[PDB]
Design a protein around this ligand. Sequence first.
Ligand SMILES: Cc1cc2nc3c(=O)[nH]c(=O)nc-3n(C[C@H](O)[C@H](O)[C@H](O)COP(=O)(O)OP(=O)(O)OC[C@H]3O[C@@H](n4cnc5c(N)ncnc54)[C@H](O)[C@@H]3O)c2cc1C
Ligand SMILES: Cc1cc2nc3c(=O)[nH]c(=O)nc-3n(C[C@H](O)[C@H](O)[C@H](O)COP(=O)(O)OP(=O)(O)OC[C@H]3O[C@@H](n4cnc5c(N)ncnc54)[C@H](O)[C@@H]3O)c2cc1C
Ligand SMILES: NC(=O)Cc1c[nH]c2ccccc12
Ligand SMILES: NC(=O)Cc1c[nH]c2ccccc12
Lengths: 552, 552
Amino acid sequence: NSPSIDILYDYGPFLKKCEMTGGIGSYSAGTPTPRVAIVGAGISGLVAATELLRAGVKDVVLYESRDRIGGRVWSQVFDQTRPRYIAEMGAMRFPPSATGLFHYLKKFGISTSTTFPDPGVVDTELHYRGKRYHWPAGKKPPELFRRVYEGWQSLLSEGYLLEGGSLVAPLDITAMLKSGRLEEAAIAWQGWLNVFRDCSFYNAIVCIFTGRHPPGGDRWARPEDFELFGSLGIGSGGFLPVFQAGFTEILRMVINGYQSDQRLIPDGISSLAARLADQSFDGKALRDRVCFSRVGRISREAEKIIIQTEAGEQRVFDRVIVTSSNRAMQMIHCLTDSESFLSRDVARAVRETHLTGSSKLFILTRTKFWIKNKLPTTIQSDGLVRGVYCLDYQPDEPEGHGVVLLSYTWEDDAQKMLAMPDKKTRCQVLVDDLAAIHPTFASYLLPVDGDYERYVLHHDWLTDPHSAGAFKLNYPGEDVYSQRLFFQPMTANSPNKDTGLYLAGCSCSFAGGWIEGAVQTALNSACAVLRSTGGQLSKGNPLDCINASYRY
Amino acid sequence: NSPSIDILYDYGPFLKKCEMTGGIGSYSAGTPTPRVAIVGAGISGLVAATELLRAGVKDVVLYESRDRIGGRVWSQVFDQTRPRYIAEMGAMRFPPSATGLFHYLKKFGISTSTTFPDPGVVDTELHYRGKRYHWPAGKKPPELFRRVYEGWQSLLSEGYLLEGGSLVAPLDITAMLKSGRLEEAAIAWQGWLNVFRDCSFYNAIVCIFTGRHPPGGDRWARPEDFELFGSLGIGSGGFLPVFQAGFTEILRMVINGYQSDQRLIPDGISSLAARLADQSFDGKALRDRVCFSRVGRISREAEKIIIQTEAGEQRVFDRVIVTSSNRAMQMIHCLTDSESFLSRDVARAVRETHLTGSSKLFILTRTKFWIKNKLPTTIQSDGLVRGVYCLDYQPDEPEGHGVVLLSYTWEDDAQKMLAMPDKKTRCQVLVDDLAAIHPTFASYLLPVDGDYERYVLHHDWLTDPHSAGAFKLNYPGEDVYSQRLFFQPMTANSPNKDTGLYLAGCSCSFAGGWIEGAVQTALNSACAVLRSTGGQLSKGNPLDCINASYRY
Ligand SMILES: Cc1cc2nc3c(=O)[nH]c(=O)nc-3n(C[C@H](O)[C@H](O)[C@H](O)COP(=O)(O)OP(=O)(O)OC[C@H]3O[C@@H](n4cnc5c(N)ncnc54)[C@H](O)[C@@H]3O)c2cc1C
Ligand SMILES: Cc1cc2nc3c(=O)[nH]c(=O)nc-3n(C[C@H](O)[C@H](O)[C@H](O)COP(=O)(O)OP(=O)(O)OC[C@H]3O[C@@H](n4cnc5c(N)ncnc54)[C@H](O)[C@@H]3O)c2cc1C
Ligand SMILES: NC(=O)Cc1c[nH]c2ccccc12
Ligand SMILES: NC(=O)Cc1c[nH]c2ccccc12
């Protein structure tokens, strides 16, 4: 099994046992079920609705502000004539340790067999200060980057020597988790938290690798080695722009195996949303319970919940699950004006939780030019482009079309794309930036038929008003917000704290920016709805079985 | 004298000496003056052009992409029928310690007599966790905030005791500066740098105030006191959103006096750009040297610099000064794709320098409702509005219209505003947010004539494509970039490294987001042009006298 470190609990076993036996809970026969509203038809909203319907709730409606279901899962098609070629605007890489996510992938038969082309997994080039460095598939990175590669590796496997007592190897904390040693894992993790809770990624690695006991034996040169590490990353490409994030946010990804064995979904991750939506309950598809209307203010009148809709219409429900951004929760739903729905502590979590910026631009090329020619499959660059990924969506047809994620950027690197919103203009600027160092590669970056309107697709998540940010990533000192947001639906365990409204979505999880977070929070919030309204939960449920007590 | 800490040099006395002695430099009869381009007609550009023209460079042209001069200086008028009511979209508060800025303010007769209504200077309320806290003018802050107030004050006056070597009190370093103890000041500041170079604001105050030697002998509570302090700030309102910024950036503002005694300019800071542009040289106003065309790629042909503009037009120059954002320098001017104009080190500084986000919304109300009524003049809120400032633009007419800076936000707080770009919508959201805690105050927040189009003004600097960011504020470990950018014009001292292009603007200064920075770098880049082209500089010039070599 694979319990996550912050909760010491795996959703996989529970979901397996419940698939068999009638869902996450039930009501006695003849019981009138609550009218439930779910704000948002992303993965979290669809999963929650799914398990609520499976548990016996007759009336659930999902509100959606976009013209499509799926939210930050968005496998956009260039050309519906040729739907296999897709641009994954949002979620893209999927770790098998995300057992909550993988429960539903396995269920709907959405293949995760193929590995994702991460740097170091396929032929990779790192572009750094004008030079091209080669990183052969399945090999150690080029020699320049070796000190920092090995230093990070040694940190994962060796831990870190502090004088007042050392810290357990992340890879050992991972072994503990897989082997059911949960008290042991908890103590080891608290150890890290105590030391690095108020330290950024950059700050932490400075202390670790320039101090008295650097893992790997070599003490990192500053700033040179930190620039190198920033370009090399830790499995997902250059992490320079997230150097300001809490070091604990990085560690938990590693320990939870989210930087490991990433898979690609050739069918597109949108097929998870399609299949969830295609489920039929009581003769009616989930998709048909989606109301395409933006929700505004959410208010409380006695023991009931009032949803304002964009029509001006106003509908009342018994319980509501909210999966929109914490930004939407503050500014649109107005959930932070008072103590009507959330405590002051949780309201602070909602108001102050950090969402990243992120942008992507894709191009559909005539050919998969990188295969038969001399070229890298992936390029990680200190230039504008940042992360380049070449994608093969039909490996058995080597002469099919190419999909190139020409630029994938985070935070500042993405905030840069904000001027030049014209995708033609952005594309050519990016190609020209890449061409400064690898003109041979850039020469193939032309859209099919020279049509930039059709065969270039881009998106900035930060300025998307349906998202207001790409994904949550806590700064140092802010992990407690994840705790508060994750355990918010556990108010259903305490009728005096239970306002009938529960927060959900990966932004309210311990895994911001991972569909796993959406799934876990969906399960917690769906369970809360059942318990709050007199239903009984299946044994092993998260509301009773998560008892982790960390201090952040 | 007020020499700033990072350069140990004051621009004031030099500019005073040069004023009536023929500028910063001169050419012998027999030396031809260069043809110069300056990209950008903000304060930095205008000052540079001014001093080049004063030194007898006859051919200087300024390029400007906006529909106006002044850049991030922008005293926007609500209604030209009533032009005295202005909204300071950019620069707003001016510290007398900014002796470069004040040299020009004084020269042009721009009044700075009136003190800016900072938190604690005028009657103030802090709104925090749904409660109001009163802060009478000139008094200590409310009791809730007293411990963190006094903690900061003790840090400033005592410094920081640590075992490896205690750090001199910032107020003592400021004293060394003023008394001309520059060698002692440098040692003092280098000490702080050694300790906190790689530490964020939050991380530093955490170590300082939860450690063994909390200034004031009072240890702060985590997280409680850091939330209070995030709301309290250090003289400029709630600094919570800049908690990720390098501590050294916070310290240098304090030491340089930029947090003391801010002045308001009733005529609007835009009157500086106006007065600069109104100056006449060689029969021609500076303003008529401004070419309103966006500069694209900048290139090198022979030993000349080619400027591309937005028509397809193109001009050739001997020397160029670039004051546009680092983002423009990388993506528009393409200064970073090679070592044509900038070293790899300076190119990195250009690419990786952090610009903040920041937004303002102003409303013009029928009356100065805060004067007659009990109401605070300033509010600092943990809510959506963050910073609220009431502005009196005709103090002798108590019946005049009032200007309210309804919301002034930075970083994440400003990033929240990017959805809802409609100003009626944004205005009412902010007003509603404030009304939750102070409904009486909010009842006055109505635009004149109820016209939200005419009497509300707002700007998001982050998505402004002429700025691509509000102002520069280094993260931990990035102060080296400020050094690199500030000293780039000193390449004129080295003909081997002199590429004929020089960087300027506050973004390239040690004073990111202060006009002082734009002035300092303007004087530097002008001196560079002169020396590079065979003119001699007046004694006391920054190219010769700035010899600080700190380790960042
Ligand atoms: C760039 C990017 C890359 C990512 N990479 C990965 C990855 O590699 N692997 C991975 O597992 N995950 C990845 N993620 C994270 C993943 O996409 C999310 O964890 C997942 O989509 C969770 O969705 P959710 O349901 O929690 O929220 P969402 O998907 O955002 O769903 C919320 C829904 O609410 C709707 N809404 C908003 N406002 C209203 C309103 N006012 N009224 C009604 N509806 C409203 C929105 O339209 C949205 O559809 C990535 C995300 C981004 C952005
Ligand atoms: C929100 C905010 C608040 C501030 N508050 C204060 C304060 O209280 N006190 C203080 O002293 N300072 C403050 N500042 C900082 C102050 O505004 C700056 O230091 C100063 O205005 C910058 O002048 P500059 O010439 O260096 O840069 P800019 O003013 O940015 O000048 C650059 C010029 O180049 C132009 N340009 C851009 N691209 C091109 C192009 N491609 N081709 C041709 N031209 C181009 C731009 O339009 C702009 O006019 C504040 C700034 C902001 C943003
Ligand atoms: N699933 C992802 O790779 C997105 C993401 C989540 N957390 C991150 C931290 C840094 C960079 C990307 C991410
Ligand atoms: N002159 C200003 O107030 C803007 C500014 C410069 N540096 C800052 C740091 C934090 C907040 C504002 C600023």
